[PDB]
Amino acid sequence: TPEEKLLRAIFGEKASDVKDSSLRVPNGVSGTVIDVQVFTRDGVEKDKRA
Amino acid sequence: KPLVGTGMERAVAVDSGVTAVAKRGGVVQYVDASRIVIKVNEDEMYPGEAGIDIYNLTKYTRSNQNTCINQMPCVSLGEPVERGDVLADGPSTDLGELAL
Amino acid sequence: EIKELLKLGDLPTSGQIRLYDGRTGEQFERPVTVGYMYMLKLNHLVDDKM
Amino acid sequence: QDVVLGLYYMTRDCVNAKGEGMVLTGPKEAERLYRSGLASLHARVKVRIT
Amino acid sequence: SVITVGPYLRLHQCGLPKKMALELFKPFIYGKLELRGLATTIKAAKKMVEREEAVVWDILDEVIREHPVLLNRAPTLHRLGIQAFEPVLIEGKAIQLHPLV
Amino acid sequence: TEFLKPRLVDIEQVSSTHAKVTLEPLERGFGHTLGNALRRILLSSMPGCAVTEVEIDGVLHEYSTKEGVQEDILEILLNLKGLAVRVQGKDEVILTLNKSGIGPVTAADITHDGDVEIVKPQHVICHLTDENASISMRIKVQRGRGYVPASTIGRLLVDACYSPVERIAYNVEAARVEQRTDLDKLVIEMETNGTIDPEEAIRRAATILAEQLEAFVDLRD
Amino acid sequence: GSVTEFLKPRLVDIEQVSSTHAKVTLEPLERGFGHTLGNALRRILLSSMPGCAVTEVEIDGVLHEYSTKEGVQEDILEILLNLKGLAVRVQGKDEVILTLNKSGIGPVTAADITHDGDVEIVKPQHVICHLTDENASISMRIKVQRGRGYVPASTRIHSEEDERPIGRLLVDACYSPVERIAYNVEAARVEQRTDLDKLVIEMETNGTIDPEEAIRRAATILAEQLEAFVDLRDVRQPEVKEEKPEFDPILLRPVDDLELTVRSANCLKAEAIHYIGDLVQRTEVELLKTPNLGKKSLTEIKDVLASRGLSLGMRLENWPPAS
């Protein structure tokens, strides 16, 4: 929207063609991470942490 | 362990795989929060193919209702134990006797 | 036999015992019942149910 | 349940037992009750009711 | 939420959990925030309540003042199944109720 | 590191005798501790003067009857219990009440003493029926402490009210502090007579409680 | 002022049955006061008492409290639970870091802790661990603080240590040194009058505090609290906070929020630039004359400032209002 285009124009665009969908701990609960795990697809660039 | 009991709770805990019961009775060699190793001692197997008996005992895993299910060693090191008694305890129990 | 066990370790062979408020510290009119009941925290609980 | 048992205990005329017909005037009886001496379920006892 | 007895309450009051009432009167908190000041804009109010910043609670204490909240139980047999109360903020996650009703 | 002080203080006097005082900023249990403490001080540990002995002419025992009086001896003594007396500087004073005729026998009919100050002069004590009726009695006032009952010739014993406070109540009420959460605000409701106002009454109780315990304070730091 | 009679209470014989159990007797007491001071002292003793307690524990090789360690019969949770009941008495501090190293077969008690000159340990026989194999060794750092009234780790979500390393394990705090408190009135045989009582106070603590300072601190709290019961000015709060920010609230945030390189962060921390309210009104002329600040650092600053919308070396001669 024009107003939003102007707004980012006043504070810097960086209008990346990407969105956001990161896994976040649900509001309310809170605790300690005890174990991470990653099941990669058979034919995909494995991660550093993976 | 529950004060006023029925005596049945000692059977329940050991009847369920929840607690680690000694397969073959002998003498405890190594205790640990990670595992328990016992030395068969009195009458091993037919072949003289080493005594010992290692019990890995799971710890701090999640349950189907997201309840903490872990096992703790109730027997100390260098302690004699017979066949069929609790070496490592489990969730909601007190050395053989169930405690909810 | 319960009354029999109420002795030995020394205890009022009736279960009754006079208690003091704590706030006022004054004695309660009637002797109340005090003991040890094996209670357990069920599932359900809050956090989830909210 | 709870409150009714309370007001039931706030009546229940019991004979004697730190009773006697020491008369006063309503609110003052409260001071009498907190300051012990007299019981609570006695005796009967007389007072001035407005 | 799960209900609990509240002896210290009056007959026109009910114990409404802090975080619960916070999420419930969201749009009211926004409006009152932007009205007084504090939040420069609507999104500012959102970010301000999303980051529970002390003062927001007091603003909440203003919005729930004489704003009745009506409670309801599962088996609604008669009219008295849903009755209104004045919300009283309670540090807890359970809903308190007057033992008379 | 230490503790906090109650800041918001409200006092509403529903008259000269009945009053309500609220102190909000308070920690856990303190509201009840100070409540019970001040209550146990105000309900007995207070001074004040009250009628203790009554000697009426023609009346030797409490189960007797008076002639020309609408009210029997027990009711008379009962009305005497509600006599607020403020003595200047004495631990004992004798008063004489002589009155004849028809109508209400008030405290203004008591011999106007210099040291003895009657709070309520319209406080009705008796009722005379006919013109030929007359009463004369000696009312002994003493300086005591707490509530003296009947447990303690012509000397009629009467329950002594060595207390200027009629009833004391107090509430807990969780206080909504803008920093903490588990704090209470003590609400003290006092119903007193005329010997002393609730203002200086509560302060007196606090100071009386202050005399004790003080030996275990010390300063320096 | 000239009224009333009254008496005064005083301390008599403090019978120390054990290191934990104790008895404080107050003989010079009347009837009413002897029963009144009972609840006041009891409550203030069962709650509003000081004492020290463990708050944080950092163990080598252990990340979270749900892990284990080789040669340790007890799990980390149990070890933390054992450190809960650690009787510690600090001399003159508000925070101490007790180091604990121990290896080889055998039980590890509070004695294996490095005996500090300030720290006085009541029970050095307190079970903490149980090392099994002789090749097992542990080295943990324990933190003890002075406090009052519980306060677990759930209270401090993250209002302490902005970074706080992974190894640090938060443990709940049981500050109050007093376990149980009982009291009996009892008729006092005071060789004087006849109608007097003697408030007998039965006490049970952990040994990390003495009945002397215990009762005195308690009565001290009672006196300080009764202090406000003298005068009643009914003082109200002025309130009326100002609701008109003259400048952008972002200028109230420190330079840390800029999220820049460490070198530039140290330069700003050395040039006395704490908030961005000073960096926003500082020209490149002054930035060039800053020690260890080159083209890379200067470009870093202008980029992290311009991205947030702000600029470099502006002017807003209104710094800072207005508390």
mmCIF file with all atom_site columns, N, CA, C and O in Angstrom, chain G residues 52-54 86-99 110-124 142-146 207-208:
data_model
loop_
_atom_site.group_PDB
_atom_site.id
_atom_site.type_symbol
_atom_site.label_atom_id
_atom_site.label_alt_id
_atom_site.label_comp_id
_atom_site.label_asym_id
_atom_site.label_entity_id
_atom_site.label_seq_id
_atom_site.pdbx_PDB_ins_code
_atom_site.Cartn_x
_atom_site.Cartn_y
_atom_site.Cartn_z
_atom_site.occupancy
_atom_site.B_iso_or_equiv
_atom_site.pdbx_formal_charge
_atom_site.auth_seq_id
_atom_site.auth_comp_id
_atom_site.auth_asym_id
_atom_site.auth_atom_id
_atom_site.pdbx_PDB_model_num
ATOM 1   N N  . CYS G 1 52  ? 20.893 -17.180 54.159 1.00 0.00 ? 52  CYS G N  1
ATOM 2   C CA . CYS G 1 52  ? 21.505 -17.301 52.840 1.00 0.00 ? 52  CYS G CA 1
ATOM 3   C C  . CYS G 1 52  ? 21.025 -18.564 52.135 1.00 0.00 ? 52  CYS G C  1
ATOM 4   O O  . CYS G 1 52  ? 20.610 -19.525 52.782 1.00 0.00 ? 52  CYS G O  1
ATOM 5   N N  . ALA G 1 53  ? 21.083 -18.558 50.807 1.00 0.00 ? 53  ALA G N  1
ATOM 6   C CA . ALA G 1 53  ? 20.635 -19.703 50.022 1.00 0.00 ? 53  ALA G CA 1
ATOM 7   C C  . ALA G 1 53  ? 21.304 -19.738 48.652 1.00 0.00 ? 53  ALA G C  1
ATOM 8   O O  . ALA G 1 53  ? 21.749 -18.711 48.140 1.00 0.00 ? 53  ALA G O  1
ATOM 9   N N  . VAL G 1 54  ? 21.373 -20.929 48.065 1.00 0.00 ? 54  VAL G N  1
ATOM 10  C CA . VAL G 1 54  ? 21.969 -21.103 46.747 1.00 0.00 ? 54  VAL G CA 1
ATOM 11  C C  . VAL G 1 54  ? 21.002 -20.656 45.655 1.00 0.00 ? 54  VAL G C  1
ATOM 12  O O  . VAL G 1 54  ? 19.814 -20.975 45.699 1.00 0.00 ? 54  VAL G O  1
ATOM 13  N N  . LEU G 1 86  ? 21.704 -26.584 51.642 1.00 0.00 ? 86  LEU G N  1
ATOM 14  C CA . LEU G 1 86  ? 23.091 -26.349 52.022 1.00 0.00 ? 86  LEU G CA 1
ATOM 15  C C  . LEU G 1 86  ? 23.172 -25.254 53.082 1.00 0.00 ? 86  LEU G C  1
ATOM 16  O O  . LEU G 1 86  ? 22.974 -24.076 52.785 1.00 0.00 ? 86  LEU G O  1
ATOM 17  N N  . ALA G 1 87  ? 23.459 -25.651 54.318 1.00 0.00 ? 87  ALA G N  1
ATOM 18  C CA . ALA G 1 87  ? 23.530 -24.710 55.430 1.00 0.00 ? 87  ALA G CA 1
ATOM 19  C C  . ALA G 1 87  ? 24.764 -23.817 55.326 1.00 0.00 ? 87  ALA G C  1
ATOM 20  O O  . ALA G 1 87  ? 25.870 -24.228 55.677 1.00 0.00 ? 87  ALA G O  1
ATOM 21  N N  . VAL G 1 88  ? 24.565 -22.593 54.848 1.00 0.00 ? 88  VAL G N  1
ATOM 22  C CA . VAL G 1 88  ? 25.664 -21.648 54.683 1.00 0.00 ? 88  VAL G CA 1
ATOM 23  C C  . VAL G 1 88  ? 25.443 -20.376 55.495 1.00 0.00 ? 88  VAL G C  1
ATOM 24  O O  . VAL G 1 88  ? 24.338 -19.836 55.536 1.00 0.00 ? 88  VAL G O  1
ATOM 25  N N  . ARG G 1 89  ? 26.504 -19.903 56.141 1.00 0.00 ? 89  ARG G N  1
ATOM 26  C CA . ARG G 1 89  ? 26.454 -18.665 56.908 1.00 0.00 ? 89  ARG G CA 1
ATOM 27  C C  . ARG G 1 89  ? 27.575 -17.727 56.475 1.00 0.00 ? 89  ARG G C  1
ATOM 28  O O  . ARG G 1 89  ? 28.728 -17.906 56.867 1.00 0.00 ? 89  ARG G O  1
ATOM 29  N N  . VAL G 1 90  ? 27.231 -16.731 55.665 1.00 0.00 ? 90  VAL G N  1
ATOM 30  C CA . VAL G 1 90  ? 28.219 -15.782 55.163 1.00 0.00 ? 90  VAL G CA 1
ATOM 31  C C  . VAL G 1 90  ? 28.474 -14.664 56.170 1.00 0.00 ? 90  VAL G C  1
ATOM 32  O O  . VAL G 1 90  ? 27.542 -14.143 56.783 1.00 0.00 ? 90  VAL G O  1
ATOM 33  N N  . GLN G 1 91  ? 29.743 -14.301 56.330 1.00 0.00 ? 91  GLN G N  1
ATOM 34  C CA . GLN G 1 91  ? 30.141 -13.291 57.304 1.00 0.00 ? 91  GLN G CA 1
ATOM 35  C C  . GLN G 1 91  ? 29.605 -11.907 56.947 1.00 0.00 ? 91  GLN G C  1
ATOM 36  O O  . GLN G 1 91  ? 28.583 -11.472 57.479 1.00 0.00 ? 91  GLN G O  1
ATOM 37  N N  . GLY G 1 92  ? 30.302 -11.218 56.049 1.00 0.00 ? 92  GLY G N  1
ATOM 38  C CA . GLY G 1 92  ? 29.923 -9.870  55.667 1.00 0.00 ? 92  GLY G CA 1
ATOM 39  C C  . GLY G 1 92  ? 29.870 -9.652  54.168 1.00 0.00 ? 92  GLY G C  1
ATOM 40  O O  . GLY G 1 92  ? 30.585 -8.808  53.628 1.00 0.00 ? 92  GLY G O  1
ATOM 41  N N  . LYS G 1 93  ? 29.017 -10.415 53.491 1.00 0.00 ? 93  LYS G N  1
ATOM 42  C CA . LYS G 1 93  ? 28.826 -10.265 52.053 1.00 0.00 ? 93  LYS G CA 1
ATOM 43  C C  . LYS G 1 93  ? 27.371 -10.502 51.658 1.00 0.00 ? 93  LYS G C  1
ATOM 44  O O  . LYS G 1 93  ? 26.561 -10.947 52.472 1.00 0.00 ? 93  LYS G O  1
ATOM 45  N N  . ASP G 1 94  ? 27.048 -10.201 50.405 1.00 0.00 ? 94  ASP G N  1
ATOM 46  C CA . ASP G 1 94  ? 25.705 -10.428 49.883 1.00 0.00 ? 94  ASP G CA 1
ATOM 47  C C  . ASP G 1 94  ? 25.730 -11.430 48.734 1.00 0.00 ? 94  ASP G C  1
ATOM 48  O O  . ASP G 1 94  ? 24.691 -11.759 48.163 1.00 0.00 ? 94  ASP G O  1
ATOM 49  N N  . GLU G 1 95  ? 26.922 -11.914 48.404 1.00 0.00 ? 95  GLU G N  1
ATOM 50  C CA . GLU G 1 95  ? 27.085 -12.858 47.306 1.00 0.00 ? 95  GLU G CA 1
ATOM 51  C C  . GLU G 1 95  ? 28.479 -13.477 47.320 1.00 0.00 ? 95  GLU G C  1
ATOM 52  O O  . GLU G 1 95  ? 29.484 -12.766 47.295 1.00 0.00 ? 95  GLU G O  1
ATOM 53  N N  . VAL G 1 96  ? 28.533 -14.804 47.362 1.00 0.00 ? 96  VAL G N  1
ATOM 54  C CA . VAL G 1 96  ? 29.805 -15.516 47.405 1.00 0.00 ? 96  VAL G CA 1
ATOM 55  C C  . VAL G 1 96  ? 29.813 -16.701 46.445 1.00 0.00 ? 96  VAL G C  1
ATOM 56  O O  . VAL G 1 96  ? 28.801 -17.379 46.271 1.00 0.00 ? 96  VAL G O  1
ATOM 57  N N  . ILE G 1 97  ? 30.963 -16.948 45.824 1.00 0.00 ? 97  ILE G N  1
ATOM 58  C CA . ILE G 1 97  ? 31.096 -18.035 44.862 1.00 0.00 ? 97  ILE G CA 1
ATOM 59  C C  . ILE G 1 97  ? 31.942 -19.176 45.418 1.00 0.00 ? 97  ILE G C  1
ATOM 60  O O  . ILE G 1 97  ? 33.170 -19.145 45.338 1.00 0.00 ? 97  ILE G O  1
ATOM 61  N N  . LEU G 1 98  ? 31.281 -20.184 45.978 1.00 0.00 ? 98  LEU G N  1
ATOM 62  C CA . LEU G 1 98  ? 31.976 -21.339 46.535 1.00 0.00 ? 98  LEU G CA 1
ATOM 63  C C  . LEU G 1 98  ? 32.360 -22.335 45.446 1.00 0.00 ? 98  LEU G C  1
ATOM 64  O O  . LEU G 1 98  ? 31.504 -22.827 44.710 1.00 0.00 ? 98  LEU G O  1
ATOM 65  N N  . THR G 1 99  ? 33.654 -22.626 45.345 1.00 0.00 ? 99  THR G N  1
ATOM 66  C CA . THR G 1 99  ? 34.148 -23.603 44.381 1.00 0.00 ? 99  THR G CA 1
ATOM 67  C C  . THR G 1 99  ? 34.218 -24.990 45.012 1.00 0.00 ? 99  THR G C  1
ATOM 68  O O  . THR G 1 99  ? 34.550 -25.128 46.189 1.00 0.00 ? 99  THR G O  1
ATOM 69  N N  . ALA G 1 110 ? 29.698 -31.462 51.809 1.00 0.00 ? 110 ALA G N  1
ATOM 70  C CA . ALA G 1 110 ? 29.923 -30.021 51.858 1.00 0.00 ? 110 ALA G CA 1
ATOM 71  C C  . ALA G 1 110 ? 31.312 -29.701 52.401 1.00 0.00 ? 110 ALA G C  1
ATOM 72  O O  . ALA G 1 110 ? 31.743 -28.548 52.392 1.00 0.00 ? 110 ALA G O  1
ATOM 73  N N  . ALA G 1 111 ? 32.006 -30.730 52.875 1.00 0.00 ? 111 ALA G N  1
ATOM 74  C CA . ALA G 1 111 ? 33.359 -30.569 53.390 1.00 0.00 ? 111 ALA G CA 1
ATOM 75  C C  . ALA G 1 111 ? 34.364 -30.456 52.249 1.00 0.00 ? 111 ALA G C  1
ATOM 76  O O  . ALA G 1 111 ? 35.386 -29.781 52.374 1.00 0.00 ? 111 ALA G O  1
ATOM 77  N N  . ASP G 1 112 ? 34.066 -31.117 51.134 1.00 0.00 ? 112 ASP G N  1
ATOM 78  C CA . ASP G 1 112 ? 34.942 -31.088 49.968 1.00 0.00 ? 112 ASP G CA 1
ATOM 79  C C  . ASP G 1 112 ? 34.960 -29.707 49.320 1.00 0.00 ? 112 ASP G C  1
ATOM 80  O O  . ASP G 1 112 ? 35.796 -29.425 48.462 1.00 0.00 ? 112 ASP G O  1
ATOM 81  N N  . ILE G 1 113 ? 34.029 -28.852 49.730 1.00 0.00 ? 113 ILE G N  1
ATOM 82  C CA . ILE G 1 113 ? 34.006 -27.472 49.266 1.00 0.00 ? 113 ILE G CA 1
ATOM 83  C C  . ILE G 1 113 ? 35.216 -26.727 49.818 1.00 0.00 ? 113 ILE G C  1
ATOM 84  O O  . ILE G 1 113 ? 35.620 -26.953 50.959 1.00 0.00 ? 113 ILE G O  1
ATOM 85  N N  . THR G 1 114 ? 35.797 -25.849 49.006 1.00 0.00 ? 114 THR G N  1
ATOM 86  C CA . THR G 1 114 ? 36.939 -25.055 49.441 1.00 0.00 ? 114 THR G CA 1
ATOM 87  C C  . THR G 1 114 ? 36.550 -24.159 50.612 1.00 0.00 ? 114 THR G C  1
ATOM 88  O O  . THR G 1 114 ? 35.780 -23.211 50.454 1.00 0.00 ? 114 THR G O  1
ATOM 89  N N  . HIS G 1 115 ? 37.085 -24.473 51.788 1.00 0.00 ? 115 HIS G N  1
ATOM 90  C CA . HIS G 1 115 ? 36.748 -23.749 53.010 1.00 0.00 ? 115 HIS G CA 1
ATOM 91  C C  . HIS G 1 115 ? 37.138 -22.276 52.930 1.00 0.00 ? 115 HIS G C  1
ATOM 92  O O  . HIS G 1 115 ? 38.307 -21.922 53.082 1.00 0.00 ? 115 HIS G O  1
ATOM 93  N N  . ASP G 1 116 ? 36.147 -21.423 52.691 1.00 0.00 ? 116 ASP G N  1
ATOM 94  C CA . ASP G 1 116 ? 36.370 -19.985 52.627 1.00 0.00 ? 116 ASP G CA 1
ATOM 95  C C  . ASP G 1 116 ? 36.438 -19.399 54.034 1.00 0.00 ? 116 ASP G C  1
ATOM 96  O O  . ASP G 1 116 ? 35.856 -19.944 54.971 1.00 0.00 ? 116 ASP G O  1
ATOM 97  N N  . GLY G 1 117 ? 37.152 -18.287 54.175 1.00 0.00 ? 117 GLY G N  1
ATOM 98  C CA . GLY G 1 117 ? 37.304 -17.638 55.465 1.00 0.00 ? 117 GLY G CA 1
ATOM 99  C C  . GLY G 1 117 ? 36.040 -16.938 55.921 1.00 0.00 ? 117 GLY G C  1
ATOM 100 O O  . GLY G 1 117 ? 35.835 -16.722 57.116 1.00 0.00 ? 117 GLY G O  1
ATOM 101 N N  . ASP G 1 118 ? 35.187 -16.582 54.966 1.00 0.00 ? 118 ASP G N  1
ATOM 102 C CA . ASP G 1 118 ? 33.947 -15.877 55.269 1.00 0.00 ? 118 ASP G CA 1
ATOM 103 C C  . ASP G 1 118 ? 32.795 -16.852 55.486 1.00 0.00 ? 118 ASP G C  1
ATOM 104 O O  . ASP G 1 118 ? 31.930 -16.627 56.331 1.00 0.00 ? 118 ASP G O  1
ATOM 105 N N  . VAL G 1 119 ? 32.794 -17.934 54.715 1.00 0.00 ? 119 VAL G N  1
ATOM 106 C CA . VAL G 1 119 ? 31.706 -18.905 54.752 1.00 0.00 ? 119 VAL G CA 1
ATOM 107 C C  . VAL G 1 119 ? 31.822 -19.871 55.927 1.00 0.00 ? 119 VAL G C  1
ATOM 108 O O  . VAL G 1 119 ? 32.830 -20.560 56.083 1.00 0.00 ? 119 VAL G O  1
ATOM 109 N N  . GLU G 1 120 ? 30.779 -19.915 56.748 1.00 0.00 ? 120 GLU G N  1
ATOM 110 C CA . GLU G 1 120 ? 30.712 -20.850 57.864 1.00 0.00 ? 120 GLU G CA 1
ATOM 111 C C  . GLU G 1 120 ? 29.685 -21.940 57.576 1.00 0.00 ? 120 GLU G C  1
ATOM 112 O O  . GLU G 1 120 ? 28.486 -21.669 57.509 1.00 0.00 ? 120 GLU G O  1
ATOM 113 N N  . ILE G 1 121 ? 30.160 -23.169 57.405 1.00 0.00 ? 121 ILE G N  1
ATOM 114 C CA . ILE G 1 121 ? 29.279 -24.284 57.076 1.00 0.00 ? 121 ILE G CA 1
ATOM 115 C C  . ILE G 1 121 ? 28.843 -25.051 58.320 1.00 0.00 ? 121 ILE G C  1
ATOM 116 O O  . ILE G 1 121 ? 29.674 -25.565 59.069 1.00 0.00 ? 121 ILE G O  1
ATOM 117 N N  . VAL G 1 122 ? 27.532 -25.125 58.529 1.00 0.00 ? 122 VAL G N  1
ATOM 118 C CA . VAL G 1 122 ? 26.973 -25.802 59.693 1.00 0.00 ? 122 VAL G CA 1
ATOM 119 C C  . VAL G 1 122 ? 27.200 -27.308 59.635 1.00 0.00 ? 122 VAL G C  1
ATOM 120 O O  . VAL G 1 122 ? 27.801 -27.890 60.539 1.00 0.00 ? 122 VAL G O  1
ATOM 121 N N  . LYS G 1 123 ? 26.715 -27.934 58.569 1.00 0.00 ? 123 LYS G N  1
ATOM 122 C CA . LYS G 1 123 ? 26.836 -29.378 58.411 1.00 0.00 ? 123 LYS G CA 1
ATOM 123 C C  . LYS G 1 123 ? 27.681 -29.733 57.193 1.00 0.00 ? 123 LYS G C  1
ATOM 124 O O  . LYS G 1 123 ? 27.170 -29.803 56.076 1.00 0.00 ? 123 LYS G O  1
ATOM 125 N N  . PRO G 1 124 ? 28.985 -29.959 57.410 1.00 0.00 ? 124 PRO G N  1
ATOM 126 C CA . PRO G 1 124 ? 29.915 -30.356 56.349 1.00 0.00 ? 124 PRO G CA 1
ATOM 127 C C  . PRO G 1 124 ? 29.728 -31.815 55.952 1.00 0.00 ? 124 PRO G C  1
ATOM 128 O O  . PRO G 1 124 ? 30.424 -32.314 55.070 1.00 0.00 ? 124 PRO G O  1
ATOM 129 N N  . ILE G 1 142 ? 29.365 -22.799 42.959 1.00 0.00 ? 142 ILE G N  1
ATOM 130 C CA . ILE G 1 142 ? 28.115 -22.531 43.656 1.00 0.00 ? 142 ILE G CA 1
ATOM 131 C C  . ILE G 1 142 ? 28.002 -21.058 44.033 1.00 0.00 ? 142 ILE G C  1
ATOM 132 O O  . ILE G 1 142 ? 28.975 -20.446 44.475 1.00 0.00 ? 142 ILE G O  1
ATOM 133 N N  . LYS G 1 143 ? 26.813 -20.491 43.854 1.00 0.00 ? 143 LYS G N  1
ATOM 134 C CA . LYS G 1 143 ? 26.572 -19.098 44.207 1.00 0.00 ? 143 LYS G CA 1
ATOM 135 C C  . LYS G 1 143 ? 25.560 -18.982 45.340 1.00 0.00 ? 143 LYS G C  1
ATOM 136 O O  . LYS G 1 143 ? 24.440 -19.482 45.236 1.00 0.00 ? 143 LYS G O  1
ATOM 137 N N  . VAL G 1 144 ? 25.962 -18.324 46.421 1.00 0.00 ? 144 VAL G N  1
ATOM 138 C CA . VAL G 1 144 ? 25.089 -18.135 47.574 1.00 0.00 ? 144 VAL G CA 1
ATOM 139 C C  . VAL G 1 144 ? 24.796 -16.655 47.797 1.00 0.00 ? 144 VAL G C  1
ATOM 140 O O  . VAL G 1 144 ? 25.701 -15.823 47.759 1.00 0.00 ? 144 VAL G O  1
ATOM 141 N N  . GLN G 1 145 ? 23.528 -16.335 48.033 1.00 0.00 ? 145 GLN G N  1
ATOM 142 C CA . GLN G 1 145 ? 23.122 -14.949 48.238 1.00 0.00 ? 145 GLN G CA 1
ATOM 143 C C  . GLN G 1 145 ? 22.298 -14.774 49.508 1.00 0.00 ? 145 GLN G C  1
ATOM 144 O O  . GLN G 1 145 ? 21.754 -15.737 50.049 1.00 0.00 ? 145 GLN G O  1
ATOM 145 N N  . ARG G 1 146 ? 22.215 -13.534 49.977 1.00 0.00 ? 146 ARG G N  1
ATOM 146 C CA . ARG G 1 146 ? 21.408 -13.199 51.143 1.00 0.00 ? 146 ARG G CA 1
ATOM 147 C C  . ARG G 1 146 ? 20.031 -12.721 50.693 1.00 0.00 ? 146 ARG G C  1
ATOM 148 O O  . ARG G 1 146 ? 19.925 -11.833 49.847 1.00 0.00 ? 146 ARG G O  1
ATOM 149 N N  . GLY G 1 207 ? 20.503 -23.832 61.947 1.00 0.00 ? 207 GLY G N  1
ATOM 150 C CA . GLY G 1 207 ? 21.795 -23.563 62.550 1.00 0.00 ? 207 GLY G CA 1
ATOM 151 C C  . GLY G 1 207 ? 22.550 -22.441 61.864 1.00 0.00 ? 207 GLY G C  1
ATOM 152 O O  . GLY G 1 207 ? 23.669 -22.108 62.253 1.00 0.00 ? 207 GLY G O  1
ATOM 153 N N  . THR G 1 208 ? 21.937 -21.855 60.840 1.00 0.00 ? 208 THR G N  1
ATOM 154 C CA . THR G 1 208 ? 22.558 -20.765 60.097 1.00 0.00 ? 208 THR G CA 1
ATOM 155 C C  . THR G 1 208 ? 22.178 -19.407 60.681 1.00 0.00 ? 208 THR G C  1
ATOM 156 O O  . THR G 1 208 ? 22.368 -18.372 60.041 1.00 0.00 ? 208 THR G O  1
#
